[PDB]
From a paper:
The L,D-transpeptidase [name] of [name], which is a target for TB treatment, is amenable to covalent inhibition via reaction with its catalytic cysteine. We report αβ,α′β′-diepoxyketones (DEKs) as a new type of mechanism-based inhibitors of nucleophilic cysteine enzymes. Studies with the l,d-transpeptidase [name] from [name] and the main protease from SARS-CoV-2 (Mpro) reveal that following epoxide ring opening by a nucleophilic cysteine, further reactions can occur, leading to irreversible alkylation. Here, we describe the identification of the small molecule trans,trans αβ,α′β′-diepoxyketone (DEK) 1, and the potency and mechanism of 1 and related DEKs 4–12 for [name] and SARS-CoV-2 Mpro inhibition; the results reveal DEKs as a mechanistically interesting class of electrophile.
DEK 1 exhibited potent inhibition of [name], with a pIC50 of 7.2 ± 0.1, with 30 min pre-incubation. The results reveal that 1 covalently reacts with [name], giving an initial adduct with a +267 Da mass shift relative to unmodified [name] (ESI†), corresponding to addition of one molecule of 1 to [name], which has a single cysteine (Cys354). This adduct was transient, converting within 2 h into one with a mass shift of +160 Da relative to unmodified [name], provisionally assigned as 3. We proposed the reaction involves nucleophilic attack of Cys354 on the carbonyl-group adjacent carbon of one of the symmetrical epoxides, with ring opening to form 2, followed by retro-aldol fragmentation, releasing benzaldehyde. As reported, [name] crystallised with two molecules (chains A and B) in the asymmetric unit. While this structure manifested clear additional electron density at the chain A active site, only partial density was observed at that of chain B, thus inhibitor modelling was only performed in chain A. The additional electron density in chain A supports the proposed structure of adduct 3. The carbonyl of 3 projects into the proposed oxyanion hole, formed by the backbone NH groups of His352, Gly353 and Cys354 (distances of 3.0 Å, 3.4 Å and 3.2 Å, respectively). Extensive hydrophobic interactions of 3 with active site residues Tyr318, His352, Trp340, Thr320, and Met303 were observed. To investigate whether the DEKs react selectively with Cys-354 of [name], we performed protein-observed SPE-MS assays with [name] that had been preincubated with ebselen, which is known to selectively and irreversibly react with Cys354.16 When 1 and 4–10 were combined with the [name]-ebselen complex, no reaction was observed, evidencing that inhibition arises from at least partially, selective reaction with Cys354 (ESI†). The combined results of the reaction of DEKs with GSH, cysteine, [name] and SARS-CoV-2 Mpro, imply a conserved reaction mechanism, involving epoxide opening followed by retro-aldol reaction.
Numbering used by the authors:
A (entry chain A): 56 to 407
B (entry chain B): 57 to 407
């Protein structure tokens, strides 16, 4: 009279819709696992590993969608043996969606850079997407998720990041039902660091763009912003990509070139600060207007010299704030206007 | 013509007849004229003959440790038939009474498990599980798991969906629960799942955020257990609510006179673990709430936030703790059912 080994698996025989966001395990009690195999609906075996003590076996590669797996396990012991065969089917997505995360892995970014997770499909279950995203911060700081549209979600703290903060983003979305049968195509995993505090302020009262590094003025640039008919909106702008030169085409923003407010001109040293088309760029033609009157379509015109300096000394995530213009406020969902949404609204989020 | 034939759901001379079902008498090639059943004291058992005269059944429950005598007369085209049966019902060595939670008619949160607590150790856990019928609308899969030798729990893999109906039929009367132990009685309870309410206490931020149906409705600065007596991570099920309570550490195994012991009156206390973790009013730690941990394990919040928790949270709601320096709440705590992985829970420990 002795104990008979028992077998415990993380799946049920006959189970359907098994999610592939976790390994499949099989455990032996009152005995050890003598043989554990697992094959798919073809013949190919599934990779796995057994613990040295012989009690725990797990798969070591990710399991695929739309697969029927067959699991055979045998357990031995002083008091007998036990064998079990289990077959189960994994999730069968209706559609797949792949996430993309910014900033890039290893980047050093300014204090205003939000964590960004953009999917290539609409997300029916935003809560499920948020649950699947794990964000670590050192030093730890509370942030919250907020959706700019149906496909991109952002995560940021109440105030600007503290320089030196380490941020780690893991979007563990493979095998996760993101709503209406849409499952994540894969996981993504990026890490970045917050750099120096760089805040540039363009004051319409003075028509000056002052760059502050760690709270001290390092550059004062005369500027000409949008005229009354096409003014530059007030608010907080997040610096984005930087270009040695770029063709500013209004058609990419929905405004034809031939229309009154349209344009197509090649400019130098252009730093993007809004998705709606606001740049800090070289503007030789308005050097005389810079510091006095507004003549552009919204962009912050500066001298070629100050434009190259801005390009060289400003990095993705730095902040450009505009105040006292005749325009409104930059939309919070512009894509670089995250900080214009009041914190209570951002904190509460819009997972619905 | 044919002499009618009389058959019964019991047979003459039977012993150990279980009283979980009624006794019946059926006629073939004829009809029943009369059926009488009496116990050993000569008291008749209430019974009902079907309109067609073919089937007779007891209409009251039969007792343990009883000898019943059944007499049936039948008439057919070929003549009459008569029969007399005698049988003896189960003679339990012991009886056990079940207790079922939550209460009948209640509205509970999405983490509320079905509970059946017997007042004796159950030697045949499989027999008790087989005798408990759970109905859910909308239907959802669930499984049994035993916290101790006397209490068994039933829950789904994921939290309940709001609006779900749950019907529990503990049909243990007349059932052998092992080693001659039989159910003292049956129990029936029905309850409903209300709004989804999930409160997350994050130790990295030291905020207790209450979400009702996915919407942030309250943010409470909190002070959890200090390093020496930390608040454990994991999922807590909300239990009882107290306008005021005497926190006594001996109730949870720690002598009051010991270093980690305590005995203080506390306002607006919501229990979330049998181990003694509460959400309660802590005016003495208002400065530390949202900054540092200073408690014995409880979630300290301000008086206004404690009372708010008392009013808007109900039995079955969820409090989840994360990023603390403690361990994970035991799955068999009594309110930590969800800390058991579904595979371990579904497999069960019925043996
Ligand atoms: C965003 C802007 O207002 C600048 O790109 C605008 C432009 C530059 C040069 C000529 C015409 C328009």
């Amino acid at each position: 009279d002795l104990l008979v080994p028992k077998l415990t698996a993380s799946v049920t025989d006959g189970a359907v819709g098994v999610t592939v966001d976790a390994p499949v395990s099989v455990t032996a009690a009152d005995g050890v696992l003598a043989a554990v195999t697992m094959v798919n609906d073809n013949g190919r075996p599934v990779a796995g590993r057994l613990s040295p003590d012989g009690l725990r076996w797990s798969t070591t590669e990710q399991l695929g969608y739309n697969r029927r797996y067959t699991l055979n396990a045998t357990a031995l012991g002083l008091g007998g043996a036990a064998t079990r065969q289990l077959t189960f089917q994994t999730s069968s997505p209706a559609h797949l969606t792949m996430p993309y995360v910014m900033p890039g892995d290893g980047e050093v970014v300014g204090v205003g850079e939000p964590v960004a997770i953009r999917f290539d499909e609409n997300i029916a279950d935003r809560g499920a997407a948020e649950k699947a995203i794990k964000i670590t911060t050192n030093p730890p700081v509370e942030g919250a998720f907020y959706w700019l549209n149906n496909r991109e979600v952002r995560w940021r703290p109440e105030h600007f990041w503290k320089p030196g903060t380490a941020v780690d983003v893991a979007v563990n979305t493979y095998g996760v039902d993101l709503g209406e049968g849409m499952f994540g195509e894969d996981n993504v995993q990026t890490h970045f660091t917050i750099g120096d505090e760089v805040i540039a302020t363009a004051d319409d009262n003075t028509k000056i763009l002052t760059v502050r590094v760690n709270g001290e003025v390092v550059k004062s640039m005369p500027t000409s912003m949008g005229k009354d008919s096409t003014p530059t909106a007030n608010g907080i702008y997040i610096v984005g990509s930087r270009y040695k030169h770029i063709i500013m085409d209004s058609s990419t923003y929905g405004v034809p070139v031939n229309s009154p407010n349209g344009y197509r001109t090649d400019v130098d040293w252009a730093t993007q600060i809004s998705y709606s088309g606001v740049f800090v760029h070289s503007a030789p033609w308005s050097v005389g207007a810079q510091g006095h009157t507004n003549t552009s379509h919204g962009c912050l015109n500066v001298s070629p010299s100050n434009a190259q300096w801005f390009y060289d000394h400003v990095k993705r995530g730095d902040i450009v704030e505009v105040v006292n213009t005749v325009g409104g406020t930059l939309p919070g969902i512009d894509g670089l206007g995250d900080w214009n949404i009041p914190w209570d609204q951002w904190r509460a989020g819009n997972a619905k």
